[PDB]
Design a protein around this motif. Structure first.
Motif, PDB file in Angstrom:
ATOM      1  N   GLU A  12       0.825  -1.204   0.000  1.00 59.08           N
ATOM      2  CA  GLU A  12       0.000   0.000   0.000  1.00 59.08           C
ATOM      3  C   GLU A  12       0.861   1.257   0.000  1.00 59.08           C
ATOM      4  OE1 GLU A  12      -0.229   1.880   3.017  1.00 59.08           O
ATOM      5  OE2 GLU A  12      -1.767   3.344   2.460  1.00 59.08           O
ATOM      6  N   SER A  13       1.944   1.256   0.779  1.00 62.04           N
ATOM      7  CA  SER A  13       2.858   2.392   0.788  1.00 62.04           C
ATOM      8  C   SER A  13       3.629   2.523  -0.519  1.00 62.04           C
ATOM      9  CB  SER A  13       3.834   2.274   1.959  1.00 62.04           C
ATOM     10  OG  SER A  13       5.091   1.782   1.527  1.00 62.04           O
ATOM     11  N   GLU A  14       3.657   1.473  -1.340  1.00 65.93           N
ATOM     12  CA  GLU A  14       4.359   1.516  -2.616  1.00 65.93           C
ATOM     13  C   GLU A  14       3.455   1.943  -3.766  1.00 65.93           C
ATOM     14  OE1 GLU A  14       7.380   0.616  -1.693  1.00 65.93           O
ATOM     15  OE2 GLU A  14       8.469   1.062  -3.543  1.00 65.93           O
ATOM     16  N   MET A  15       2.201   1.482  -3.782  1.00 69.03           N
ATOM     17  CA  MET A  15       1.287   1.870  -4.850  1.00 69.03           C
ATOM     18  C   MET A  15       0.891   3.338  -4.772  1.00 69.03           C
ATOM     19  SD  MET A  15      -1.046  -1.552  -5.133  1.00 69.03           S
ATOM     20  CE  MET A  15      -0.805  -1.606  -3.365  1.00 69.03           C
ATOM     21  N   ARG A  16       1.128   3.993  -3.638  1.00 72.61           N
ATOM     22  CA  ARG A  16       0.813   5.404  -3.469  1.00 72.61           C
ATOM     23  C   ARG A  16       1.989   6.317  -3.794  1.00 72.61           C
ATOM     24  NH1 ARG A  16      -1.750   5.171   0.885  1.00 72.61           N
ATOM     25  NH2 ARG A  16      -2.459   7.342   1.047  1.00 72.61           N
ATOM     26  N   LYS A  17       3.134   5.758  -4.168  1.00 81.71           N
ATOM     27  CA  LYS A  17       4.331   6.530  -4.465  1.00 81.71           C
ATOM     28  C   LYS A  17       4.538   6.646  -5.972  1.00 81.71           C
ATOM     29  CE  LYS A  17       7.371   5.492  -1.533  1.00 81.71           C
ATOM     30  NZ  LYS A  17       6.703   6.471  -0.633  1.00 81.71           N
ATOM     31  N   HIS A  18       5.345   7.632  -6.360  1.00 81.95           N
ATOM     32  CA  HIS A  18       5.716   7.794  -7.759  1.00 81.95           C
ATOM     33  C   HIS A  18       6.515   6.584  -8.232  1.00 81.95           C
ATOM     34  CE1 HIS A  18       7.661   9.548 -11.361  1.00 81.95           C
ATOM     35  NE2 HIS A  18       6.600  10.334 -11.395  1.00 81.95           N
ATOM     36  N   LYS A  19       6.387   6.274  -9.525  1.00 82.19           N
ATOM     37  CA  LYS A  19       7.022   5.075 -10.064  1.00 82.19           C
ATOM     38  C   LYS A  19       8.539   5.140  -9.929  1.00 82.19           C
ATOM     39  CE  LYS A  19       7.289   6.798 -14.784  1.00 82.19           C
ATOM     40  NZ  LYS A  19       7.044   6.518 -16.224  1.00 82.19           N
TER      41      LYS A  19
END
Ligand SMILES: [Zn+2]
Lengths: 81, 143, 193, 129, 150, 87
Positions: A12-19
């Motif tokens: 969840e903390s990764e899908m909300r960050k820039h690629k």
RNA sequence: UUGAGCCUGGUCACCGGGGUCGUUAACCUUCUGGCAA
RNA sequence: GAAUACAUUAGCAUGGAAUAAUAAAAUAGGACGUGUGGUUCUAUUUUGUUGGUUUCUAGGACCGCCGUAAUGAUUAAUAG
RNA sequence: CUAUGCCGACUAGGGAUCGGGCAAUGUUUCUCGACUUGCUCGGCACCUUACGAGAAAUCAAAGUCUUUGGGUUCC
């Protein structure tokens, strides 16, 4: 805070960050195979297409390019893989 | 640069102390090895030029220092200018600076020399005012 | 039988490649597509190794001009190989030849292409050893004492009888590269990318 | 643009150590960074670090434990002889017993003390204490 | 850090970790190579080649299936333009700005932009001459720039 | 530190904060000690058996004392379901 | 082209120094002398 | 007993190849080699002594072919 | 003139604003727009605070400098 596990960040903390800002940068786009409403051939298209897509058989325009994800207006039962 | 007819001067360009008689046909050509691990080029063995001031088929000898540099100017006749680059020491600032000095060496017709084309030169006794070196080995970019 | 055995293996060891040739000929006795695809198929060498337990693995080197057919042909023969070899695993590896580092005292004017680089060859070996599943991540962890361990994160696709084949893959890579390596399957939560 | 990656790595590490965090993310990574960190690890100032191998320069996650005051770089890479090691130690290290100076000696990246033992100078990389 | 601007954008494409051909695809390598050749005869730039192939035909990265970059493929098969695509686009833009300036001499902003484009073209030309992509006596003249483009 | 004789010569050995592994100076007036006793069945914590933590003034001013104490207790096993290493 | 295992001899559980084998082939190449497929 | 070092900027030589650089072959202009054939020169040896020619012989270099074998293009930097 | 060179890395909490993108079995108006929420990139700025700096006024840079070294111009 002040003690985190940078090796295994949460999904969840990764899908909300820039690629790019992710731990390992990766694409956010994909390809899907669509079917013509009045035909049987299946054509693969890109989610961020920048060109007008025309079906192989006798058919009209498939999708319209835009800044982000192109919108599909034909009644295609797309399968994404 | 461009090799012309060797007998294109007021005086007959000739290898000293070499004679042709009836018994020995034609004119024999003499060659010598400069030494210090160098090899005499084949076209020097079988060529046309004379080049009295040449390490091969000539009179000058190779002794002293051996340097390496890039030739910058070839517009002059049978000599070139070698540009040696080095870094100087400043004890105060503990840093380097780029320093260059231009040499002056003689080139035989045996070596085809153009811009770039770093070469190796060796001391060959004073030749003309500021020319004290002669080209011996060429590491050419073409080959 | 009827010759067509010697040309299969370049060398003639005691029993390893001889038994391999006999087994593959027995499989090739079947006609049609299997025989047609196995006609331009050969082998170079095989090596018997053990694992941490009591299992035996056979590392088979494959020539480079055969991988194109081997990709779609080895799947139909690996099951027969493990069935005939009496509970022995089979692992295919594309044999390569790496080049020396250009040391000062040894001048090599032919140049070493990147494909023949030790790191590149090690990466290619790692890719080849895990045949079905592809690599999605790799991390080099250094312990406090300084020991380096490789953690290779694989995918979660085609997990049929490969959960211990990867363990055998790590066993081979333990001594085929001199670096300790472990493979791990991540968790694919949800549906989508 | 980026000039040296070791300077950025050491600046990030010292910033995290001053902030009190137990971990730090370093990007980009390099062989010089790795050799510097293992020298710091064998001297006990830095704990385990995991090198995230991407199809790029690559990243690394470092676990800290305090006990370091400042790790820095010395740019440009000055040439340090055996006799100049003492002068550099007096100039940069807190004392003659505490502090490590890293030199990229021809034998390899090593501390100043073991460089003295091997009797070989080199170029100064950095320091930590 | 833009070379001729103050922008600090980071927009780009993040290629996937899996440097492998697509799992679900039937590109057949050689078919795509001839397909690129057909489009090259049609006369579109390599950037347009990749954009069309990715958006419409469904191959994400051509080098994944082909094994070489599309410019390498074009050079190997002989359809290699004499001028690199980036330099050609820069010179074409410079020609358009020069035409705009010669029709409208009062555009000082266009004159400033022409100076920037001229500097960029010269820097790129120097790089290409150094690497060997262009003859060492390449040079760049505004009078013959139109003939260079056409 | 020890001299050539071998004994420990110094005024005192400063204590290090468990949250940051940094020593506590004599004038660190925001650095406090947290004492918690263990518990047995049916409550009734036994006096005399306790675990101690030291939090430095730098952490107290920074505001990380709460999360640091949560990590320390969770690692020791005194708390459950409060602090997680994966956020 | 990084790491692991030895032999031997050197002032103190330690250190510097020379050779090797397998990972991956282990003094590249040349001249001379010998053995020789 | 009347030492030893300091010296080494600069030059010469031995050892190491970490740090910082350029080409190692693209139209393969490539390690290709008791390999299938040819040509140019030299006598470092002998035909009785200098000298003149063919060259067995030993050596230097140039021309089309033969896959010896895994035949050759670093990812594409939260740089441009 | 921001009396504050340019490029690059890191560093604390929050809320507004501009341009773009992503997501909503969100709202509304005869397939789109407007509005609401969350995330992200690049700007203009703002409030509190000081791990830190300064002689101080003050500064998220004027911080990461006696624990003094990322690169480069002007003075
Ligand atoms: Zn259509």
């Amino acid at each position: 805070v002040l003690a985190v596990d940078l090796l295994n960040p949460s999904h969840e903390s990764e899908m909300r960050k820039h690629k790019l800002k992710q731990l390992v940068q990766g694409p956010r786009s994909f390809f899907m195979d669509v079917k013509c409403p009045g035909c049987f051939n299946i054509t693969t298209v890109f989610s961020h297409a920048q060109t007008v897509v025309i079906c192989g058989s006798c058919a009209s325009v498939l999708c319209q390019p835009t800044g982000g994800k192109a919108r599909l207006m034909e009644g295609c039962s797309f399968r994404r893989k | 640069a461009t090799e012309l007819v060797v007998q294109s001067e007021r005086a007959f360009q000739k290898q000293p102390h070499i004679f042709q008689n009836a018994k020995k046909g034609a004119g024999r050509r003499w060659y010598k090895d400069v030494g210090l691990g160098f090899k005499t080029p084949a076209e020097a063995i079988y060529g046309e030029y004379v080049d009295k001031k040449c390490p091969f088929v000539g009179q000058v000898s190779i002794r002293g220092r051996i340097l390496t540099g890039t030739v910058v100017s070839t517009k002059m006749h049978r000599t070139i200018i070698i540009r040696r680059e080095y870094l100087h020491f400043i004890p105060k600032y503990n840093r380097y600076e780029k320093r260059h000095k231009n040499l002056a060496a003689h080139v035989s017709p045996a070596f085809r020399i153009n811009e770039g084309d770093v070469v190796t030169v060796g001391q060959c006794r004073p030749l003309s005012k500021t020319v004290r070196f002669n080209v011996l080995r060429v590491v050419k970019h073409t080959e | 039988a009827l010759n067509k055995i010697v040309k299969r293996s370049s060398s003639q060891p005691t029993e390893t490649d001889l038994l391999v040739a006999q087994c593959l000929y027995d499989l090739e006795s079947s006609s049609k597509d299997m025989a047609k695809e196995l006609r331009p198929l050969q082998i170079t060498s095989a090596r018997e190794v053990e694992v941490g337990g009591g299992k035996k693995a056979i590392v088979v080197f494959v020539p480079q001009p055969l991988l194109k057919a081997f990709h779609k042909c080895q799947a139909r023969l690996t099951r027969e190989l493990e069935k005939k070899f009496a509970d022995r695993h089979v692992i295919f590896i594309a044999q390569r030849r790496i080049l020396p580092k250009p040391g000062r005292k040894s001048r090599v004017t032919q140049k070493r292409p990147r494909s023949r680089t030790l790191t590149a060859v090690h990466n290619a070996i790692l890719e080849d050893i895990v045949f079905p599943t592809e690599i999605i991540g790799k991390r080099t962890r250094q312990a406090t004492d300084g020991r380096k361990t490789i953690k290779v994160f694989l995918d979660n696709r085609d997990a049929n009888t490969v959960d211990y084949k990867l363990g055998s893959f790590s066993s081979v890579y333990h001594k085929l590269t001199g670096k300790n390596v472990t493979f791990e399957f991540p968790v694919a939560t949800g549906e989508g990318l | 643009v980026r000039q040296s990656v070791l300077a950025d790595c050491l600046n990030n590490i010292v910033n995290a150590e001053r902030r009190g965090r137990r971990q730090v993310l370093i990007r980009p990574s390099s062989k010089v960074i790795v050799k510097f960190l293992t020298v710091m690890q064998k001297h006990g100032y830095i704990d385990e670090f995991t090198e995230i191998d991407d199809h790029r320069s690559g990243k690394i996650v470092i676990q800290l434990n305090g006990r370091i005051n400042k790790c820095g770089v010395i740019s440009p890479r000055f040439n340090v002889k055996l006799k100049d090691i003492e002068k550099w130690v007096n100039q940069l290290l807190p004392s003659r017993q505490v502090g490590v100076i890293v030199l990229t000696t021809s034998r390899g990246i090593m501390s100043h003390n073991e460089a003295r033992a091997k009797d070989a100078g080199g170029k100064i990389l950095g320091f930590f204490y | 850090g833009r070379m001729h601007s103050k922008g600090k954008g980071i927009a780009s494409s993040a290629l996937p970790y899996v440097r492998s051909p697509p799992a679900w695809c039937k590109a057949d390598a050689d078919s795509v190579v001839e397909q690129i050749l057909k489009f090259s005869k049609k006369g579109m730039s390599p950037s347009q080649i990749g954009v069309t192939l990715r958006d419409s035909h469904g191959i994400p990265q051509v080098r994944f299936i082909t094994g070489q970059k599309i410019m390498r493929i074009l050079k190997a098969n002989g359809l290699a333009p004499e001028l690199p695509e980036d330099l050609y686009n820069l010179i074409k833009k410079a020609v358009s700005v020069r035409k705009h300036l010669e029709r409208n001499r009062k555009d000082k902003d266009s004159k400033f932009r022409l100076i920037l484009i001229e500097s960029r073209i010269h820097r790129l030309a120097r790089y290409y001459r150094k690497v060997g992509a262009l003859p060492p006596t390449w040079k760049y003249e505004s009078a013959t720039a139109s003939a260079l483009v056409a | 530190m020890e001299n050539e004789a071998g004994q420990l010569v110094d005024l005192y050995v400063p204590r290090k904060c468990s949250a940051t592994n940094r020593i506590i100076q004599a004038k660190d007036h925001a650095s406090v000690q947290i004492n918690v006793c263990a518990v047995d069945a049916e409550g009734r914590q036994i006096p005399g058996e306790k675990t101690t933590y030291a939090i430095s003034g730098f952490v107290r001013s920074k505001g990380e004392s709460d999360d640091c104490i949560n990590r320390l207790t969770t690692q020791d096993g005194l708390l459950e379901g409060v602090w997680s290493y994966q956020r």
